[PDB]
Design a protein around this ligand. Structure first.
Ligand code: HEM
Ligand SMILES: O=C(O)c1ccc2cc[nH]c2c1
Ligand SMILES: O=C(O)c1ccc2cc[nH]c2c1
Ligand SMILES: O=C(O)c1ccc2cc[nH]c2c1
Ligand SMILES: [Cl-]
Length: 393
């Protein structure tokens, strides 16, 4: 018997306060059935980790949102990387892994760190700033579109295009419907920027298109791979940085430990990813009967993984509701796990580290001062507005 729960993890009330319900999702049993969306769910670390690490049984090619692409029309042409299984997955994965490699990171690191220090110096001139518009959004907007080689015009579409992508993995609720109704101008902007003549030399976009020259990908595949980094590579980093600042603001003792040792920046960012989990959920579809958490699930069944919940499961983590910058974070699933584990994670940690290093060296206190506003999305967790006073060191 699988416990049935009436919890809607894509409701606004859930997003506004997910932690009691994520507890119930873990504590009802290792596998649950959600009445609202007629789907099975796993919320504990053990099951989440196990499902991510068996892609043959728990496939991604039938979609990693609620929609089963074997039965339903995808809202757009599927991603060649996220919505593919090995072996088809492997060549696109290899392309993007090379494009966002450690060696690539070394070549852009100094520019990113200089941008982050300039950003923080400038916020300190105003003092009262919005840690989302002025920092978690503005910083990645200042580095990532340029690292891609995007033109200046139309960049206002990038944040809402990714809200659309992340809303679309959800169930058919109002967030998802309104996003698709409003999608056409964002998709048109992204489609044009995926084309080879629109991507500046030296940037990730042109680097992807250079794989056509050796035959490693076709000219039809290359724009779809650029489209993956424009879908996945901005709003996630915005929300991880936003999380990290919100954590440092709510946990003033941790900000003082980071000031005491700025080399903790990279880990303080990793721990914000665990603690907030910007990507809260993904689905897989079984490709055979499987025993999961003691229950036998049939072939062809969607399974929802609660990544945020797994990252707070007291089965795996000591004091999971505490933000601890020296936590051993290795093994969190905020970037996934296994063959699809975030191929952009070094870009994310690069941005997060240099920004928290700049904060570590320049700022003495971060105090929330003004109303905090959450942004609701089917898959992304983050704030719309976080008004803070920054006190210079
Ligand atoms: C804090 C920031 C980020 C978080 C939390 C995040 C989270 C994730 C997660 C959970 C997955 C696994 C998907 C699955 O298992 O189905 C993933 C994969 C991926 N991420 Fe990220 N990511 C972040 C930043 C980035 C960036 C900066 C980029 C690109 C520049 C990126 C590009 C991708 C792509 C293309 C995949 C698909 C990899 C695959 O299917 O093999 N992400 N990400
Ligand atoms: O043009 C489209 O909307 C569309 C939607 C779904 C798919 C699946 C492969 N091609 C598509 C195009
Ligand atoms: O601040 C924005 O422009 C904005 C608009 C829509 C979304 C959807 C996810 N993040 C957003 C930011
Ligand atoms: O390949 C993509 O288009 C894509 C879209 C969203 C996500 C979120 C994690 N990885 C992604 C890849
Ligand atoms: Cl699209």
């Amino acid at each position: 018997t699988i416990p049935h729960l009436a919890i809607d993890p894509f409701s606004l009330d859930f997003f506004d306060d997910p932690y009691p319900d994520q507890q119930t999702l873990r504590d009802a049993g290792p596998v649950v059935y959600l009445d609202k969306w007629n789907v099975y769910g796993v919320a504990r670390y053990a099951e989440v980790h196990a499902v991510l690490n068996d892609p043959t049984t728990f496939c991604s090619s039938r979609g990693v949102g609620l929609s089963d692409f074997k039965k339903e029309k995808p809202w757009r042409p599927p991603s060649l990387i996220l919505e593919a299984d090995p072996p088809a997955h492997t060549r696109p994965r290899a392309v993007l892994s090379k494009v966002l490699s450690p060696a690539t990171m070394k070549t852009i690191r100094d520019g990113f760190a200089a941008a982050a220090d300039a950003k923080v110096d400038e916020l300190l001139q105003r003092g009262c700033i919005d840690a989302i518009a002025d920092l978690a959004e503005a910083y990645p907007l200042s580095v990532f579109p340029d690292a891609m080689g995007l033109k200046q015009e139309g960049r206002e579409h990038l944040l809402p295009y990714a809200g659309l992508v992340f809303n679309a993995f959800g169930p058919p609720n109002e967030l998802r419907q309104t996003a698709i109704e409003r999608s056409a101008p964002h998709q048109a902007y992204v489609n044009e920027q995926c084309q080879r003549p629109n991507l500046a030399p030296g940037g990730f976009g042109a680097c992807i298109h250079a794989f056509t020259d050796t035959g490693e990908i076709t000219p039809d595949e290359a724009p779809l791979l650029v489209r993956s980094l424009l879908s996945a590579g901005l709003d996630t980093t915005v929300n991880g940085i936003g999380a990290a600042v919100y954590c440092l603001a709510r946990f003033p003792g941790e900000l003082q430990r980071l000031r005491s040792d700025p080399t903790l920046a990279r880990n303080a960012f990793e721990e914000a990813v665990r603690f907030e989990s910007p990507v809260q959920t993904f689905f897989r579809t079984t490709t055979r009967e499987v025993e999961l958490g003691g229950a036998v699930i049939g072939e062809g069944e969607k399974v929802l993984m609660f990544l945020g919940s797994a990252n707070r499961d007291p089965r795996r983590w000591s004091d999971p509701d505490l933000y601890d910058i020296t936590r051993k974070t290795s093994g969190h699933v905020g970037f996934g796990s296994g063959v699809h584990m975030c191929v952009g994670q070094l870009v994310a940690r690069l941005e997060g580290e240099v920004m928290l290093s700049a904060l570590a060296r320049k700022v003495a206190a971060i105090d929330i001062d003004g109303p905090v506003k959450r942004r609701f999305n089917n898959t992304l967790r983050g704030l719309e507005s976080l008004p803070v006073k920054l006190t210079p060191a």
